[PDB]
């Protein structure tokens, strides 16, 4: 359930981290999914190909554009495939930060939250800005909107949200369309305030949501903006005052203080956001309230600790040499989606070392040794 208020504003490039992997462990003749997970990049424009034997795979899908707390984007490109002995797979990524496309080969051998993410990217001459909105309950996407898609409707991405009737979808479609129209205005407004040319492409990002404890009672709320991956204005934890990053955001801050925008946001974050998060947790209890403990194992190099098929994504993998936390000389890979609702992770640093796994689905933390 989105916010029914779109206040207008008044008034650094990051290269993608790439991971290529399969959904399940590879077994010849067994149908699987080949994933390429790009993350931590800015701006959002990116070209991702899945390669099979030095050739592009035709039918490749990808997740809806979302971003992290630091405003950097992440995407999951995937396709169904049956691996065999001869076939070799890789992922090729092109981005403004790269002098040439990077290829990465596939090595065959509690609390709850609701979040809404909004991205609008200007395309001068090419048409109206590309607007993408996604909604999350914890680490599960359940709604989306894409301005270039055919439906021009808010679409379901989880089974438990398909229950909702036409009044729900009409309202969310109305609100998300007004979201995009406001960000379109914000793009043209921010271009002039920063004295930028009309030909360049720019990005505005909006994020808001609410956290609840295990008692489903309000904990914290968020409502922040970014321009070109840089903090612009954010609502503080008290939900009453604003943090402005630079002089352009000070004008927006004063306009929003005079219009009492924070009062309307606090009512949403403390009340409406919590109310519908509780409804979603109930309607999708089979999916949202499950815990899946990580299937763990270890491998030795000629030491890598693995964790697979766990939910939620929150996990901790630490290395200990004789009990002391060995932070240095430790390669920790970012948690990645398997594509079926579960997640994966591994860390790398013989009998003196141990791997510690902490996860909500585990009765007690696990220790792994060679």
């Amino acid at each position, epitope marked *: 359930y989105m916010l029914d208020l779109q206040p207008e504003t008044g008034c650094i490039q990051r290269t993608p981290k790439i991971q290529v992997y399969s959904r399940h462990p590879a077994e010849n003749g067994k149908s699987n999914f080949l994933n390429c997970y790009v993350s931590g990049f800015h701006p959002s424009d990116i*070209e991702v190909d899945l390669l099979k034997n*030095g*050739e592009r795979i035709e039918k490749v899908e990808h997740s809806d554009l979302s971003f992290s707390k630091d405003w950097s984007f992440y995407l999951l490109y995937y396709t169904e495939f049956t691996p065999t002995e001869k076939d070799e797979y890789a992922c090729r990524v092109n981005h403004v*930060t790269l002098s040439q496309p990077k290829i990465v080969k596939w090595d065959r051998d509690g609390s709850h939250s609701m979040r809404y993410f909004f991205t609008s990217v200007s395309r001068p001459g090419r048409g109206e800005p590309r607007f993408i909105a996604v909604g999350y309950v914890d680490d599960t996407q359940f709604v989306r909107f894409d301005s270039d898609a055919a439906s021009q409707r808010m679409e379901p991405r989880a089974p438990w949200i398909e229950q909702e009737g036409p009044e729900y979808w009409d309202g969310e479609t109305r609100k998300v369309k007004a979201h995009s129209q406001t960000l379109r205005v914000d793009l043209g407004t921010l271009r002039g305030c920063y004295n930028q040319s009309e030909a360049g492409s720019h990005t505005v990002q909006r994020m808001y949501g609410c956290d609840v404890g295990s008692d489903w009672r309000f904990l914290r709320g968020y409502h922040q903006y970014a321009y070109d991956g840089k903090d612009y204005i954010a609502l503080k934890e008290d939900l009453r005052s604003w943090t402005a990053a630079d002089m352009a955001a000070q004008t927006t801050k004063h306009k929003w203080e005079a219009a009492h925008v924070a009062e309307q946001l606090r009512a949403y974050l403390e009340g409406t956001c919590v109310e519908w998060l509780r409804r979603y947790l109930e309607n999708g209890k089979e999916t949202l309230q499950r815990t899946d403990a990580p299937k763990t194992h270890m491998t030795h190099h000629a030491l890598r600790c693995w964790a697979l098929s766990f939910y939620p994504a929150e996990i901790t993998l630490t290395w200990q040499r004789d009990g002391e936390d060995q932070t240095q000389d430790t390669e920790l890979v970012e948690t990645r989606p398997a594509g079926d609702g579960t997640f994966q992770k591994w860390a790398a640093v013989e009998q003196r070392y141990t791997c510690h796994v902490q996860h909500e689905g585990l009765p007690k933390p696990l220790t792994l040794r060679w």
Partner: nanobody
Amino acid sequence: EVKLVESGGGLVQPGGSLRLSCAASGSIFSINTMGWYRQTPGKQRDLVADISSGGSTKYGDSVKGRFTISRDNTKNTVYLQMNSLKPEDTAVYYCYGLSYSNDDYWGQGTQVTVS
């Protein structure tokens, strides 16, 4: 191991045409997809056109309809027919190839300038 020999660039008038050519050395079983990227004004190089050994093609949006890639798959040589050239097509066009193990090879590039 693999060497890519490029030719066919140079100066051309607006509306004119050029035919780039790229021949791969070594075994025929050493290269699958062959094609071209071109240097953007900044750091990046953008996809122009490439073709698999089976003849599967892909074009960048800014050259669709005007550029045509073809392949004489006896010699692992690909040809890029660049029609209706504009000043915005001016760049260094890098030939590239993919091995059947997804190793990428890159040529030195050929400057293309449209008056």
